Amino acid sequence: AALVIDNGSGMCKAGFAGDDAPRAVFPSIVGRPRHQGIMVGMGQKDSYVGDEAQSKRGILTLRYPIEHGIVTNWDDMEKIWHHTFYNELRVAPEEHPVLLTEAPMNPKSNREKMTQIMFETFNVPAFYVSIQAVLSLYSSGRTTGIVLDSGDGVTHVVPIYAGFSLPHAILRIDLAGRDLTDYLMKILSERGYSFSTTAEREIVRDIKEKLCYVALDFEQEMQTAAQSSSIEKSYELPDGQVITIGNERFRAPEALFHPSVLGLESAGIDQTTYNSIMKCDVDVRKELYGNIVMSGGTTMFPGIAERMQKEITALAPSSMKVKIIAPPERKYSVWIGGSILASLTTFQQMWISKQEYDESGPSIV
Template identity: 60%
Template sequence: MTQIMFEKFNVPAMYVAIQAVLSLYASGRTTGIVLDSGDGVSYTVPVYEEKLGYIALDYEQELETSKTSSSVDKSYELPNGNVITIGDERFRCSEVLFQPSMIGMEEQGIHEIIYNSIMKCDVGSNHVDRNHFDLKKELYGNIVLSGGSTMLFHGIAHRMSKEICALAPCSMKIKVVAPPERKYSVWIGGSILASLSTFQQMWITKVEYDESGPSIVHRKCF
């Protein structure tokens, strides 16, 4: 991509940013773990330096309630004017994010992905265990949701908080952040980054590209 931008489009300078970092910038943070879910993929990245559907807080309890009560039922008018009633489908659809096995996928739920990402974080052998604990504490306290799929279902932040609390040590304070503009968090973070006075020192110039070639992107951006 670096080669295409400089040699085909003749841009004067460019920079490649990590989406998760930009999402953190958009939420006013520089440390945290980002769950980015959208465009057909969900992933987590630890970083340090409303429709009819919803997320059930307790899936099994909500499922039992739907069998004996119509409280979860909602009516929806189709474009052709027909009206349909939607019941437990409202939360069964989104439950796949937490239980992929429901559709035959042997994958972890998004809450387990976050937990395992945090547990795999290591500040290095030259740091004491206390710093390692503090890093995990920072990540548990800054879980940021990002991406269009996190906007589709009401209640995802509360459900995520509940699931992480069940997995994490009881001494950890869990905070899940779901910015209202999270569908565009990456774009907002990019705008913030580009507006910084120090950004000109970060980007790759055409002169630098001519001197070092495409590999310079690994040195200056990642």
């Protein structure tokens, strides 16, 4: 069996081929102690990763090596893998073929460098890197389909026509699920809401998942949040404070459709789907319109598929078959696409061998 470790910018999932559920899902945080000391519990080890590092903030300085699905620190990315193998899955890298992923339009060298570390420090018998949207599409059982990830890290639209990405429309918005939790962490303050420590900011992340939704029409909604507490839903903060959450419930996800409320004059996810589709050839366009598959964590918000269905209908011809497909598992599809791909018998000759690595080297991909 052969592993899959999808390098989320904030959420890394590991496991094998064949498993339906991702085996090792954790906060993709490298933690190092603020004063490394002689003993156990006292901050002893030069790096932690996951839920351990997460509670241990109080002793650590936390890092996210992966920014916008582009691994901006390798000396930390490595040591995540060294925990992901030995501490999560509790296995030795040199035994299992590994499948690991990439954010679309990855600068080749950065791929080649993942390719380097995997076979060199990690000595894994085989490897293959894989595009995030394209695996999530495989977890719908499709070849064809324009896909739009919105994860923790970065938001990415790809014209996947028949199992191939068409680069020229692979659009990115760098406002995402992190900057959405942030979008909430802005707008709760003059009800005295306290989100400012990483603990508090965690709590605002939870509220984003649980209560925040995409209104079907923003302005109409607002006036219902004015007229009635219909929107207004209470929540007990971990200390015990019965708070109530209202407009922010629909205002927080809406940065995906209006990047402007964050402060980025970028096209909304809808506008960006459309603009990716037109940037493809006329016949590619038809299926893309009918097979828009949502992926990632930030595509979870109640409202989002029905809303995308509304707006892309306004944006396309009246007689154009707009059709959204969203996985209930979309925070994990990118991993599922790994596990499926590694288990695909057909694909056993498609892995990067240790042989090719040592005859031909990192550049071959």
